[PDB]
Write a protein that binds this ligand. Structure first.
Ligand SMILES: O=C(O)/C=C/c1ccc(O)c(O)c1
Ligand SMILES: [Ca+2]
Length: 290
């Protein structure tokens, strides 16, 4: 569905269990049922009115467990319940939905930077591996447009990436696309109109406020207006033809700042701030609870 912006887990001193929902209609937040396990560098998505939290890591004071977890949140009940886990733990995961099916992309397992990719069947509650990406990517940005899944940037273990690639499901194939103008890991990646947006991230030197978009038709990346705050490991989603960026690290602060991009006016504005500063959250949109 679509009515609230849910932000699940994230990081500040350690991984966090928070689920809170923003209402752009009235500027209001709700605190909702905590994740059963705290998680940073996870991804959110939504299928048939249920919110999913996928992978990440528990950076606790008593150890650092990378997650293979798929946890399901029903806003009708305000409860989390476990779903089938993935083949492997994926911290700094990218996630995308094609026709009711969830794709989990790359991310890290301790030292290991994954190229692997796997697909969840909600009704059957089963995961199956698909074709690996051409490139190992963690902190990868992942978005779906026209039933094609795009994997943008991240970190291959040695180099941060400007590269990007496209999964064609009918062929179970990955092809390279035009690289970005800017090297980005931990970028906020989403879809709006006929473009894949890569917002912020890290180029190896500094946190970025630049936003560029890929036209799937023309195959070019153009910069748009930048965000006010430089950010990496930011949350990103789309509601009512607008990009929302939540949180991130600017090099000095875990930002509580929420920016909104208007593609009509090519401008960003501050629309609220989160109850607390935090990085590496999952974000997605569904019906309001209860
Ligand atoms: O207007 C903005 O928001 C973007 C521009 C910008 C902001 C900060 C910098 O350090 C910089 O080189 C460029
Ligand atoms: Ca490796």
């Amino acid at each position: 569905v679509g009515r609230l912006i849910y932000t699940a887990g994230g990081y500040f001193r350690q991984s966090l269990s928070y689920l809170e929902a923003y209402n752009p209609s009235n500027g209001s937040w709700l605190r909702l049922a905590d994740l059963q396990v705290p998680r940073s560098g996870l991804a959110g998505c939504v299928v048939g009115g249920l919110l999913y939290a996928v992978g990440g890591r528990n950076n606790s004071p008593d150890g650092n467990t990378d997650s293979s977890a798929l946890d399901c949140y029903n806003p009708m009940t305000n409860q989390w319940s476990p779903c089938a886990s993935m083949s492997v733990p994926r911290n700094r995961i990218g996630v995308g939905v094609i026709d009711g099916h969830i794709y989990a992309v790359g991310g890290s397992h301790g030292c290991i930077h994954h190229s692997s990719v796997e697909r969840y069947e909600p009704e059957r509650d089963e995961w199956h591996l698909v074709a690996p990406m051409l490139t190992r990517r963690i902190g990868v940005g992942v978005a779906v447009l026209n039933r094609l899944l795009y994997a943008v940037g991240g970190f291959d273990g040695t180099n941060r990436l400007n590269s990007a690639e496209c999964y064609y499901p009918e062929r179970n194939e990955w092809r390279m696309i035009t690289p970005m103008n800017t090297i980005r890991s931990g970028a906020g990646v989403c879809v709006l109109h006929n473009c894949i947006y890569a917002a912020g991230g890290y180029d190896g030197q500094d946190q970025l406020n630049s936003v560029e978009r890929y036209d799937v038709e023309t195959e070019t990346w153009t910069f748009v207006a930048p965000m006010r705050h430089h950010r990496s490991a930011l949350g990103i989603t789309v509601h009512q033809g607008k990009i929302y960026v939540l949180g991130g690290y600017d090099g000095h602060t875990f930002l509580d700042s929420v920016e909104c991009y208007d593609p009509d006016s090519d401008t960003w504005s501050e629309v609220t701030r989160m109850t607390s500063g935090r990085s590496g959250v999952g974000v997605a949109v569904t019906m309001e609870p209860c």
